[PDB]
Scaffold this active site. Structure first.
Site, PDB file in Angstrom:
ATOM      1  N   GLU A  11       0.926  -1.064   0.050  1.00 38.45           N
ATOM      2  CA  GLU A  11      -0.044  -0.065   0.187  1.00 38.45           C
ATOM      3  C   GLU A  11       0.860   1.187  -0.057  1.00 38.45           C
ATOM      4  O   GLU A  11       0.522   2.254  -0.484  1.00 38.45           O
ATOM      5  CB  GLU A  11      -1.005   0.083   1.155  1.00 38.45           C
ATOM      6  CG  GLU A  11      -2.095  -0.916   1.059  1.00 38.45           C
ATOM      7  CD  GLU A  11      -1.468  -2.221   1.724  1.00 38.45           C
ATOM      8  OE1 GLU A  11      -2.369  -2.927   2.622  1.00 38.45           O
ATOM      9  OE2 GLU A  11      -0.261  -2.729   1.561  1.00 38.45           O
ATOM     10  N   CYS A  38      -3.297  -3.420   7.106  1.00 37.24           N
ATOM     11  CA  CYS A  38      -3.157  -3.278   8.305  1.00 37.24           C
ATOM     12  C   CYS A  38      -3.281  -1.792   8.663  1.00 37.24           C
ATOM     13  O   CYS A  38      -3.363  -0.834   8.077  1.00 37.24           O
ATOM     14  CB  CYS A  38      -1.509  -3.458   8.594  1.00 37.24           C
ATOM     15  SG  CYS A  38      -0.343  -2.171   8.109  1.00 37.24           S
TER      16      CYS A  38
HETATM   17 ZN   LIG Z   1       0.141  -2.658   5.682  1.00 41.53          ZN
END
Ligand SMILES: [Zn+2]
Length: 187
Positions: A65, A94
């Site tokens: 990301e 996350c």
């Molecule tokens: Zn992450």
């Protein structure tokens, strides 16, 4: 910096990595597929497509990301143009990535984002739910990949060799279980 986006994925890889069947085990990679769409009042280009990948733990926070975020800033950004970023990730962001996104968003007011995910990552632990909950609060769409999503990805991010997408057993039931779970969590 190192990361440039891959153009696409192999049918072997895609079928393995995006399985939403409860193989919470061996899938130790995170795969991000995106579309980036520029609009200058008359909806012109840019149009960009690609694939980022990531080891779940080693390394970390050069996450798939962030890799996208970093690359997107230098190589793609244009002043005064409405953007529409779309992600299709194999694992849920996350909290760190989630937090880093929110920061990226406030900096770039002219960008919008939707995320589709195949599986929900580490979802029994509050921190991971909070992250997505935070994205929900920051204005980001977080959705579970349905049939037409896995198909869209086949039609865009796979070296499909003209073959049509073909669903796995229990794809549809997985989707609903993951929808309710995400629903309850973002209430
Ligand atoms: Zn992450």
């Amino acid at each position: 910096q190192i990361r440039n986006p891959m153009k696409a994925m192999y049918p072997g890889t895609f079928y393995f990595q995006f399985k939403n069947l409860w193989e919470a085990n061996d899938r130790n990679e995170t795969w991000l597929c995106f579309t980036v769409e520029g609009i200058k009042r008359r909806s012109v280009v840019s149009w960009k497509t690609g694939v980022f990948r990531n080891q779940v733990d080693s390394e970390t926070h050069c996450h798939a990301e962030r890799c996208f975020l970093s690359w997107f800033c230098d190589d793609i950004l244009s002043p005064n143009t409405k953007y529409q970023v779309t992600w299709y990730t194999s694992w849920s962001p996350c909290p760190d990535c989630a937090g880093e996104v929110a920061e990226f968003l406030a900096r770039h007011s002219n960008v919008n984002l939707t995320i589709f995910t195949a599986r929900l990552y580490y979802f029994q632990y509050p921190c991971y739910q909070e992250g997505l909950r935070s994205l929900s609060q920051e204005g980001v769409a977080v959705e579970i990949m349905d049939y037409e999503d896995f198909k869209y990805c086949w039609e865009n991010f796979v070296y499909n060799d003209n073959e049509p997408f073909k669903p796995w057993k229990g794809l549809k039931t997985n989707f609903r279980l993951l929808k309710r779970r995400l629903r309850e969590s973002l209430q």
